């Protein structure tokens with residue numbers, strides 16, 4: 001009895017194999033969608049490993065006859081209808097710890113790139129700009145701002161948010177956060193200021209950074225309405241989920257100068273391109289291809305944890321043996 | 329009696345005027361060299377304000393008949409033969425406080441850009457790269473590394489170095505420093521590790537960042553010899569002085585992969601260009617046009633301090649009244 005475990009949206013299973021070699025038949029599908037998956041896998045697969053590049057609706061889930069557990073190789077699971085998955089008897093789990101600090105470090109890099117304009121200054125030199133005089137330095141580096149005394153607003157004070165807050169303090173940022181699902185008192189433990197509404201957050205924050213999961217109640221959390229609530233010349237950073245931001249509203253804000261700059265590692269439609277979308281001709285923009293998470297150590301770590309979860313499921317009882325089940 | 333005060337390498341004196349209006353005749357020269365300066369200024373100027381774009385040798389200093397004080401609008405004064413200046417009875421002063429944290433923030437941005445590859449990832453998207461799969465993310469973000477447990481080596485633990493150390497700790501960096509002119513015990517106050525030699529520093533450091541002044545004994549401190557002392561795949565960051573690095577040795581190291589990446593805000597010959605010099609075809613390179621210092625608040629601050637120093641000189645006694653004389 002060697003049940004089938006399938007990596008849906010990937011082609012490499014090397015890291016997972018030594019953890020599943022003796023308890024599972026391991027295959028990959030390199031599929032961007034269900035249509036790309038073989039009937040055999042849909043029919044026989046007892047467990048599934050997936051990243052974020054594929055989405056599983058209830059319809060897509062129904063195509064799995066033997067599937068009993070899904071493990072997201074990552075923390076975000078907005079790409080899975082976990083409630084239905086659970087109704088179908090399919091446990092869904094994630095890997096929340098592997099890339100917390102990598103993601104927090106990327107977030108700070110982006111924040112610092114907006115405040116110090118390092119990436120744009122480098123892009124300009126590549127383009128040929130010559131900066132001889134001090135006058136020119138000020139002109140080309142225009143927009144660069146002193147960080148101390150500035151207020152950083154954190155939306156979602158979880159693992160990454162907390163990691164960001166602690167680093168941000170070391171730069172002299174006054175750190176605020178809005179997280180309506182957290183219990184009373186976390187702000188005291190970490191020496192932070194808390195606000196009760198998103199509007200308060202956006203109103204007092206010079207730089208807004210997103211670190212909340214994408215759920216039923218925060219799609220386009222940043223929109224034409226809430227953008228108007230944001231400070232004039234404010235910064236925006238997103239290393240969480242693209243669906244949190246209406247890129248139409250963000251684009252216009254950037255062109256209008258209502259928002260001085262934005263740094264995005266995630267987008268409404270990924271992969272991102274500078275030639276495709278509302279952000280096409282939008283200025284003062286930094287963008288990275290969902291790589292805030294990445295380091296060799298982290299990638300290996302999350303894949304090893306996911307396989308272990310898969311193994312706990314096959315060898316034990318669902319969902320009692322699971323360490324990171326998000327849909328009990 | 330309204331003595332002449334001249335801004336040598338600049339054209340704007342607006343910030344200085346309200347501080348000198350009643351005690352000095354203020355003029356500017358917008359000169360990249362002495363040859364560009366009018367005889368009247370060379371003859372009559374009693375005080376001089378200058379940035380870093382002009383250099384004053386003893387020969388250039390001798391062209392000043394009435395000059396009594398020079399104030400560097402900035403901290404670095406390697407562009408002035410201060411010893412000769414003093415022999416000629418000319419006090420030289422600087423402005424060491426204004427852009428400490430700006431410079432430290434830029435330094436961190438660069439360090440984070442090397443470790444997280446944010447600037448290169450953004451450049452790639454601009455170039456058209458499409459990153460659809462996880463495999464592609466790892467490939468394009470290859471070289472991105474986990475920061476915790478890494479060792480940051482600081483050369484020169486002064487104002488900026490200390491500011492960098494404190495921030496760096498917040499990312500999980502193990503921080504070392506080499507500063508042979510500092511007194512016993514500073515390492516204990518700030519919770520840092522100290523080494524006695526440059527070789528030790530370079531040998532234990534995954535990322536090396538420079539924060540020492542340019543003096544008689546550290547030109548090309550980083551050279552073919554000392555580069556060989558650097559760890560394999562090490563990072564290099566420089567926001568201090570260009571003359572500290574032999575760009576020939578750095579280039580070859582980058583091409584050979586002996587150095588994985590370098591981030592430079594200063595250069596042997598400024599202004600810098602990607603089309604001119606040894607770094608011309610050198611890879612894994614980030615470069616900014618000496619803007620680590622810049623913020624509107626800082627620029628105004630240092631100019632106001634410099635004028636005040638000029639005023640202290642005219643209205644008081646040299647060098648007893650001076651706050652920041654570096655060549656007593």
Ligand SMILES: NC(=O)C1=CN([C@@H]2O[C@H](COP(=O)(O)OP(=O)(O)OC[C@H]3O[C@@H](n4cnc5c(N)ncnc54)[C@H](O)[C@@H]3O)[C@@H](O)[C@H]2O)C=CC1
Nearest residue numbers: 076156157158159160179181211212213218239240292293
């Ligand atoms: N770009 C990348 O490579 C990576 C992105 N991420 C993303 O970052 C996000 C945060 O990850 P973690 O901190 O590990 O998750 P977490 O579960 O530890 O933290 C989420 C926090 O956001 C809060 N939150 C949820 N909805 C909210 C709303 N509408 N307003 C305010 N706060 C809200 C929750 O109370 C929770 O404390 C995730 O959504 C994940 O998708 C995570 C890892 C890597």
Ligand SMILES: NC(=O)C1=CN([C@@H]2O[C@H](COP(=O)(O)OP(=O)(O)OC[C@H]3O[C@@H](n4cnc5c(N)ncnc54)[C@H](O)[C@@H]3O)[C@@H](O)[C@H]2O)C=CC1
Nearest residue numbers: 404484485486487488507509539540541546567568620621
């Ligand atoms: N790129 C920019 O916009 C800016 C650059 N800078 C540069 O950064 C450098 C540091 O500035 P601060 O920290 O304010 O100066 P500082 O005088 O406060 O610190 C200099 C430190 O370097 C140490 N040092 C000198 N020679 C050394 C050597 N051979 N090896 C090891 N350590 C050595 C000294 O002991 C001293 O502690 C300056 O040289 C300045 O030119 C400063 C401000 C802005």
Ligand SMILES: O=C(O)/C(Cc1ccccc1)=N/O
Nearest residue numbers: 051073074075076099293462
């Ligand atoms: O966005 C996520 O859920 C991530 C990032 C990730 C993880 C694995 C592969 C790609 C991106 N969490 O780690």
Ligand SMILES: O=C(O)/C(Cc1ccccc1)=N/O
Nearest residue numbers: 134379401402403404427621
């Ligand atoms: O390099 C320096 O000495 C600086 C940076 C600077 C200052 C004024 C104008 C340009 C650069 N110190 O602040």
Ligand SMILES: [Ca+2]
Nearest residue numbers: 206232233234
């Ligand atoms: Ca502002």
Ligand SMILES: [Ca+2]
Nearest residue numbers: 534560561562
């Ligand atoms: Ca290394």
